[PDB]
């Protein structure tokens, strides 16, 4: 039984859920950011699509209740399912997080602001010009399609992480 919450209907006509099926979705006529507010708890009514969350490695968080036990019915019963709050991966679970609002456009989240990433790290942005790539990087971030991607490694808390990073060059 899967446990992923999608509540998508673009009142403003974004055409955002038209972007999950590509060969077509590549549109961003208007592209003309990272500083957020610390992660609390969202509940599936505000969510559409997966909820990616950055350890150096990207992870999707599953539906659950007020406690940790999961939901398994596609987030729909006042489903306080995403416990996105944590300190930092040396101590906590992740740095920061991104999911798509049903708005059609979404916002990010991150640890208290201020290599240097494991010190001053919140969202998927390693540096101002570089983010971490996850299967929905183009969807949540449609203005970074022209970034060049490459492989990198990073040691965090004693374990090695292998990442794919996209950058404006």
């Amino acid at each position: 039984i899967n446990r992923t919450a999608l509540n998508c209907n673009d009142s403003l006509h974004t055409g955002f859920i038209a972007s999950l099926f590509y060969t077509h979705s590549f549109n961003s006529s208007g592209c003309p950011h990272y500083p957020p507010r610390q992660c609390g708890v969202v509940s599936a009514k505000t969510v559409c699509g997966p909820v990616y969350c950055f350890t150096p490695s990207p992870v999707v968080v599953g539906t659950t209740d007020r406690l940790g036990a999961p939901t398994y019915t596609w987030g729909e019963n006042e489903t306080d399912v995403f416990l996105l709050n944590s300190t930092r991966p040396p101590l906590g679970s992740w740095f920061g997080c991104t999911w798509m609002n049903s708005s059609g456009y979404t916002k990010t989240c991150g640890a208290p602001p201020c290599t240097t990433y494991l010190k001053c790290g919140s969202g998927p942005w390693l540096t101002p010009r570089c983010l971490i790539d996850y299967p929905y990087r183009l969807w949540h971030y449609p203005c970074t399609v022209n970034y060049t991607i490459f492989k990198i490694r990073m040691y965090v808390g004693g374990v090695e992480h292998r990442l794919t990073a996209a950058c404006n060059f």
Partner: antibody
Amino acid sequence: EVQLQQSGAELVKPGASVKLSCTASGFNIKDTYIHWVNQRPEQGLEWIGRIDPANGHTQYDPKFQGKATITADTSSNTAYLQLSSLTSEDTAVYYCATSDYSYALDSWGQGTSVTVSS
Amino acid sequence: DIVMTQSPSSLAMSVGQKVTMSCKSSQSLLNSNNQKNYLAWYQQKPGQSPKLLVYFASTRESGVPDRFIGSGSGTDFTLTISSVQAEDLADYFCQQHYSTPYTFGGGTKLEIRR
């Protein structure tokens, strides 16, 4: 230093073929390059090729083409090395090593020794 | 193909002393954009798989003791152990990660004098 588990010691008759395994644990293979290095009895090291498992792109040393074909399957987090038409100078140990953009082999596997004899 | 010549082929050192072995390439390994030398040093203890000591000529790999130091530029490279230990016995390989095909050195075998 991520960990990579290789297949077991293989005995191959002269002329036969053999495929070697290299399975990766603790990370997604698509964020690394997967190289294959060779070492013959009391010899140096030799780079055979590499594969980008994110797009399948493979580079090889010219001296090994036709003899070695590198493949990767992100389903099983596993890369392979297929040796075709083996001779006695193919008797060696075959390593698999990860890399980042720098192409420096930062983490290796335990190796797989191949013996080509009748 | 870039040719890597390692000297010497064999090396003996008492414990606690400093030893140096050299690596030379057939063409420059210095990047003009990067100002980085794409040379790597590997240690292969007998009956084991090679381990990454230094990459980018002088950047020591995480977890490696600080007695291993890579130095050089352009075409002349040296690996140095500040004070060799009884465990340091190995075949030390230098490799260029500059251009395809990536070529290896002959290797410098380190013995211990007791």
